[PDB]
């Protein structure tokens, strides 16, 4: 009954929420997370490989 | 008898027909009148046509056979419009009736037999 144990645990579907930029640094821009930096990181790697 | 009323039913087959008409009216599967019989032929929703040969001008119903031969629809005549009047549950003489297609109707077995009997009249 391994799946039965899994179904009970996943009864609650509230997922962890994201934190925002602090107010006193609002004019700088959005606080980047791993999902955002990965877009900027893969962009650099493609150009350097091409050169 | 006027020869234009060729499919004329006998005594025994008339009893089966008028019983089936009375059954069909209860199941809301019957269209009464010359004009209403014509409309079902256009829509292709008729099993057969029952007409009254005792109309004083026989010509007013002779347009129905022409439509039947194109749709391959059997048709018969009966000797009385007044006998046709009661079986349809109407208080007036009726010269033409049409029984409608109904999906899943329990009258299919009885209708299937009566169509075969009509075709036997044409030999």
């Amino acid at each position: 009954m391994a799946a039965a144990f899994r179904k009970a645990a996943k009864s609650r579907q509230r997922e962890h929420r994201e934190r925002s930029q602090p107010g006193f640094r609002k004019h700088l821009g959005l606080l980047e997370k791993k999902k955002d930096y990965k877009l900027r990181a893969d962009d650099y790697r493609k150009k350097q490989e091409y050169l | 008898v006027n020869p234009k009323a060729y499919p004329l039913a006998d005594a025994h087959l008339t009893k089966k027909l008028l019983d089936l008409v009375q059954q069909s009216c209860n199941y809301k599967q019957l269209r009464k009148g010359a004009n209403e019989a014509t409309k079902t032929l256009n829509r292709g929703i008729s099993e057969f046509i029952v007409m009254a040969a005792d109309a004083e001008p026989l010509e007013i119903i002779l347009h129905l056979p022409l439509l039947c031969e194109d749709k391959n629809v059997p048709y018969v005549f009966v000797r009385s419009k007044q006998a046709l009047g009661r079986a349809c549950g109407v208080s007036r003489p009726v010269i033409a009736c049409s029984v409608t297609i109904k999906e899943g109707s329990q009258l299919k077995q009885q209708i299937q037999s009566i169509q075969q009997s009509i075709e036997r009249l044409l030999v």
């Binding site: - | 022409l66 031969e69 194109d70 075969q116």
Partner: protein, 237 residues
């Protein structure tokens, strides 16, 4: 809605020869009118700029239902002789007459005297239709009127369809000719299943030295119907 009268519309040829497509907001199947300005059963016709086309109704016709269903071959082409069994009033016959054109001929067979009077009125206006008011079960009775033909179209709707076609095919159909037969499952055998009926009729056809080639159903327009296309006495390849 539909194709209202007074709408701009395009006519382009179909894959089959002699058949046309009426391209517009909705598409209809049309054939070129042999006698301009006349409607035989009230269909909607289109004027093209001296030239006119007539719409083909697939609910009232068994050949048009097959064409819309995607049949591979119909073998009715301009300049061909076509023998039609079971002409009835002439709704389908008129469209067949349009395809064959002035050169081809249509032999219309209809036993009933009531519907026979409509063919003669229709044959008056169309010079390439030969009315034959005779029983199709006895081809020897009208062997005077009919020469060799190329295509036999059968819509007789009888329990003995195969035998009727077999007699006429031997007497009149030329070698290498083709045949189109419409099968109504409820007519041959109501007791047996519709699918087993289609297998039995094909079996009888092969016993009559006829080679069936294709079949398809006409489901969106008709229930328990099939159309079988084949060749008679094929030439060696």
């Amino acid at each position: 809605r539909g194709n209202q009268s007074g709408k701009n519309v395009m006519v382009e040829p179909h894959r089959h020869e002699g058949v046309f497509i009426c391209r517009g907001k909705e598409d209809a199947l049309v054939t070129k009118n042999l006698v301009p300005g006349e409607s035989v059963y009230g269909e909607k016709r289109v004027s093209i700029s001296k030239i006119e086309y007539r719409a083909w109704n697939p609910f009232r016709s068994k050949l048009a239902a097959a064409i819309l269903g995607g049949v591979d071959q119909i073998h009715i082409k301009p300049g061909a002789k076509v023998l039609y069994l079971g002409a009835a009033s002439g709704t389908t016959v008129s469209h067949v007459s349009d395809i064959v054109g002035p050169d081809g001929l249509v032999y219309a067979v209809e036993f009933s005297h009531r519907s026979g009077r409509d063919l003669i009125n229709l044959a008056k206006k169309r010079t390439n239709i030969i009315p034959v008011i005779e029983d199709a079960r006895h081809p020897h009775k009208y062997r005077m009127l009919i020469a060799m033909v190329d295509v036999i179209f059968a819509d007789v709707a009888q329990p003995d369809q195969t035998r009727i076609v077999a007699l006429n095919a031997h007497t009149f159909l030329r070698n290498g000719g083709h045949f189109v037969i419409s099968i109504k499952a409820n007519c041959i055998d109501s007791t047996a299943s519709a699918e087993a009926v289609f297998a039995s009729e094909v079996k009888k056809m092969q016993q009559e030295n006829m080679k069936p080639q294709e079949q398809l159903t006409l489901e969106p327009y008709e229930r328990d119907h099939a159309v079988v296309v084949g060749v008679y006495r094929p030439p060696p390849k």
